[PDB]
Amino acid sequence: SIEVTPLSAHIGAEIHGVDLTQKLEARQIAEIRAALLKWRVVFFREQFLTHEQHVAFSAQFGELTLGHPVFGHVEGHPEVYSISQTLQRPWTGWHTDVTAAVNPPWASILRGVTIPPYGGDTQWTNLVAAYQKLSAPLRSFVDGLRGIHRFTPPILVTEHPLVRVHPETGERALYVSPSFLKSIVGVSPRESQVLLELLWEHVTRPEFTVRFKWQAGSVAFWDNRATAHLAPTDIFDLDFDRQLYRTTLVGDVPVGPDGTQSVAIEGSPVSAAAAVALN
Amino acid sequence: SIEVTPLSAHIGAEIHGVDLTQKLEARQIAEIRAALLKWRVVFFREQFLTHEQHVAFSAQFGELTLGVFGHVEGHPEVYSISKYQTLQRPWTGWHTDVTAAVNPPWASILRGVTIPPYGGDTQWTNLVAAYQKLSAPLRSFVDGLRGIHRFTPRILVTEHPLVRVHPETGERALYVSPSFLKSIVGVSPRESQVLLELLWEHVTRPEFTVRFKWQAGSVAFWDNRATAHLAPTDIFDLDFDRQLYRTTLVGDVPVGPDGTQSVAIEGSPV
Ligand code: NA
Ligand code: NA
C-alpha cells in the first residue's frame, strides 16, 4: 500500500514506498494509477533510474511513444526524450502536450538526472477543477465548442472539443492547451480571441495549480487528459546544468460532451513525433 | 554561521542553523538581515514559538507595530490569522502590507501554528526584479509616476511613488500593491486603468514569484519594501483548521527616484 501525500487542495501528490528500479506488483501499479487519476500529477523522490528502468516503469501504465530521429533523441532508446522576445501574458508557456495531434499522449513520465540547486520549477494546473469552476452558463456554452490546435515544428492541425470527457473517470476537462489552441470553430475572430483569453486566464488561477521544485532522482507523472503544465524559464538565466528524460504514453482520440471525436485536419507522422519530442 | 538555501532564481530562501526561541547574537541577526535583504523573503522550519518568543525574535530587527482585529490576548503586537463572489484577475489578492498608510511596515514575520496537511500555501513576488525587467522606456516612465492607495474597513488614503527606492539597498521596487493601489495621479481614468493592469500583470509573472507550503512551526519573514504576497483562497475549500500569527515592524515614509516622499491624504500613520 503506497503512501500518498497531497500537495494542494485539488492537484498534486507525492508517492512514497515504491522502488521504481524494480518491477512493481499489480496492486502497486493500480494504486499509483488511482492516485494519478485522482491528483492529476504524482511525484516520486530519490528514484535514480537508468533509461531501461524508466521505460520499464512507464510500460506498466501504457504503450510508450516512439520518438523523433533528431529532437530529443537518445541513442538506443527511441522511447526516451532528452530535456536539457515573447509576448508575456498569464497563460504564456502553459500547454497540454502535443494537442496539435489528433491523439495526444495521455500521460508523461519525466525524471530529473542533473538538477540545479534552485531554479527550474515546473507547474501544473487542474483542467477538471477549472471546468467545474466556470459558471453553469459558461460550462454549457463551452460544452458545445470546438477548437483548432496548431503546431509548426522547427505542420499539425487538429480540431478538438473545448471540453474533453475523461475516458477513465468521466470528468470534463477544460481542454484549452494555451500554447497550441489557436481559435474556436464557428465564431468570429474577435469572439474567439475574447473567449480564449477568458478561459486561459481562468485556467491559470493559483487555486488550480501546483508547483514542484526538482531534485536529482525526482519523477513527475502527469495525466495530460486533465492538466496543462508550465516549463521553467528561469533556467535560461542561471549557470546550472539541467538534464531530464521523458517518456510518454500513447493516448486515444479525445471526445467532447456530445460524443464528437477530434478530427485531424493537417499533419505528417514526422511532424507529430517532433511535437511529442518538443512540446 | 547560518545556512541559506535559495528557493528560486531571485526570491525566497530557507535559513537553517538558528534557534529562534533564544536571543540571537549580533552576528546571527546581521546574517539573517542580509539574507532577508538579498532574497526578499526568508523561511524557517521547526521553530515552535510562544507569542512572547515571536515578539522577541521580531524586536531584534526593528520596532514592533501595535495594532480588536486579530486580537491576541496579552500581546498587542501579535495579530491572529484565523480561518474564522469577487472579480478574478491575475493580480487578485496580491498586495503589500498596509500601503494605504503613509508609513507601511517595512517587514512582517508570520508563523504557522495550526497548519493544514495540504492547502493554504502563500506566494511572494519580487518587486525589484519586476521593476528591472520592465523595458528601459517603461522604467523611466514609471519612475516619475505617483499612485493613490486606499483602504476602507478608519479610512486611509495615501499618495505613494510607483517606484520605491529601497532605503537599505538603494534598489528600485515596482511599488504597485495591487489590492490597495487604485489610480495613477495626473493621467486619465482609462490611462490609469490600462497602465495599472499592465504593471499588475507584469508583477505576477511566475519568474518573479516563490510559493511556500507551510508546516507547523514554519516562519516567513519578508521585506515589504521589495515584495507583494498572496494569501491562499482554498481555506474554506477544505475542512482543515488554519491558524497563524503575525508581527510587523514599523517602516519609514517611502521615497521615489526623484526624492519625493509619500504624502498622507486621509487617515493616521501606522
Ligand atoms: Na510540455
Ligand atoms: Na498581507
Side-chain angles (χ1 to χ4, degrees), chain A residues 163-194:
Chain A
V163 178
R164 180 177 185 175
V165 180
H166 194 291
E168 294 186 70
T169 70
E171 299 162 301
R172 292 175 182 188
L174 186 53
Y175 201 63
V176 292
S177 193
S179 294
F180 306 134
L181 172 56
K182 306 306 185 180
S183 62
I184 295 175
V185 175
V187 305
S188 80
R190 178 57 178 161
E191 291 164 0
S192 174
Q193 178 174 60
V194 161

Side-chain angles (χ1 to χ4, degrees), chain A residues 6-10 39 88-90 94 117-119 121 123 201 205-207 209-211 213 230 233-234 237-238, chain B residues 6-10 39 88-90 117-119 121 123 133 201 205-207 209-211 213 230 233-234 237-238:
Chain A
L7 294 167
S8 75
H10 295 288
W39 289 106
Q88 295 297 318
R89 305 297 312 272
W94 285 94
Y118 55 93
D121 293 2
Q123 307 196 45
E201 160 180 77
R205 287 219 297 273
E207 73 203 83
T209 71
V210 66
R211 181 168 174 166
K213 179 171 188 297
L230 175 66
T233 61
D234 61 352
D237 223 84
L238 301 167
Chain B
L7 296 169
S8 77
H10 301 284
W39 289 105
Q88 289 300 316
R89 306 300 311 275
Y118 52 94
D121 293 3
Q123 306 195 43
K133 290 289 172 169
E201 165 183 69
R205 292 215 299 259
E207 40 261 62
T209 69
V210 67
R211 182 166 171 172
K213 182 173 188 299
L230 172 66
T233 63
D234 51 21
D237 189 25
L238 301 159

Side-chain angles (χ1 to χ4, degrees), chain A residues 22 24-26 28-37:
Chain A
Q22 301 304 297
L24 302 189
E25 301 294 309
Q28 289 177 285
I29 295 164
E31 288 173 340
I32 294 172
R33 194 185 189 94
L36 172 67
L37 295 189

